[PDB]
Amino acid sequence: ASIKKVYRGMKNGAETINDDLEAINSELTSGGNVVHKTGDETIAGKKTFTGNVEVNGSLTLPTKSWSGELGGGIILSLRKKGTTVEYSIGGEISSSILANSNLVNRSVPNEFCPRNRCSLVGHMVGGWNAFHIDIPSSGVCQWFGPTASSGTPRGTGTYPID
Amino acid sequence: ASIKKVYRGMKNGAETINDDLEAINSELTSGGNVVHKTGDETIAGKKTFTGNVEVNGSLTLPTKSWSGELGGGIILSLRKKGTTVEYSIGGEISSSILANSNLVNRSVPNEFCPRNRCSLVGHMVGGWNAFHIDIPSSGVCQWFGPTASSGTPRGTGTYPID
């Protein structure tokens, strides 16, 4: 709070002491630079909780999305939430993708790139066929299915980021 | 704050009252045992937020990693972050793994073991073949592909822990 000096020989001493006590006490309920057990508040600084934390409402972390055609008609849709990337494989194979080939139409942007190679497992509609697409730290994705020229690739999951 | 008694008949009364008000008021900005809207602070005790929480920076939870060859050349790399385990299947099949067999070179350590059996889906480089490896509560992983003696198994995802 913003208080007034209580000093030897001041006028209205009792009034000043009371005013200061009231302003200080007000900040034990709300406002000022203190975090309270009620009210919508914005809190700066690094806060380390050494104990257990429970959140009964929603917990919202920073979020960003990106989607692009990696190559050969394969679409990768991403959403970063904290240190996790939610992915969804989409699109439809529109040209021949060679076994073990790099997908060169779009690279995954640096901010969605993992520390180490992540293998995203997918499945082709209408049969029993699976594949995986690697996302390396470079974001230059690689197709690890066999040579394929058609089909509908799908798969939802996550991979970690730093 | 650490304050001085204000009492009937004390000397320097105004000075003592002012000193106490100032020390108390200082703790409405920083220090003491109060959590503030600024500053890097360490907070003990169980904290339950009944409302909505937003974190604009990073949210860091306890983390631990483990990696090992489960068996037959298959490597499982894990990272526990809170109640989630991030996994990555690696290695290369170096000996025959029978259909439905236990992987007995390494068990997943107890602290990375789920409550119930988790089926981790993977894919073999260069073809359309998928498999899954079960992680039971015992950590004695099981191969659910057919009998296989070669190949490069991959797959990134997560499974839950208590």
């Epitope: 709070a1 913003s2 009034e15 005013d19 009231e22 302003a23 000022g32 914005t42 809190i43 | 809207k37």
Partner: nanobody
Framework: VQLVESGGGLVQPGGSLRLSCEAS????????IGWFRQAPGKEREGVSY????????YVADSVTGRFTISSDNAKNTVYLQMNSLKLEDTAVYYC????????????????????????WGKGTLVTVSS
């Protein structure tokens, strides 16, 4: 929605300086506009504020008799006249706008954010050295 400061500089002890804050983009009916200051080596401390409605003021004990606050609602500008400057007045001074409550001569900023303040200026450096 901007608070623009000016007037900071280097002065010798006993020197004078006049800070200005151009406040625009908000009501005023509910606000007090004023000044804090902060070392790189400190948290903020409130210096002096003025009610944008009734003109009631606050002046911190560390600066009473030396610093005086003024306003002019038209130019959307608040002033801090800093006289008899001391080495310990060295800091970056931030213009601030906040909703508040008073208890006689004592004040409290009521905002949900840091220091109970809604808006901050970029800051103006005041340096007092021999």
């Amino acid at each position: 929605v901007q608070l623009v400061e000016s007037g900071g500089g280097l002065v010798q002890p006993g020197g004078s300086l006049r800070l200005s804050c151009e406040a625009s983009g908000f009501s005023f009916d509910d606000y007090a506009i004023g000044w804090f200051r902060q070392a790189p080596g400190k948290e903020r401390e409130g210096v002096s504020y003025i009610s944008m409605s009734d003109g009631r003021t606050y002046v911190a004990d560390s600066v009473t008799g030396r610093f005086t606050i003024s306003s002019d609602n038209a130019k959307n500008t608040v002033y801090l006249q800093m006289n008899s400057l001391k080495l310990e007045d060295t800091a970056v001074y931030y213009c601030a706008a906040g909703r508040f409550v008073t208890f006689g001569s004592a004040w409290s900023f009521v905002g949900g954010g840091p220091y109970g303040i809604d808006y901050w200026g970029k800051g103006t450096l005041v340096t007092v050295s021999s």
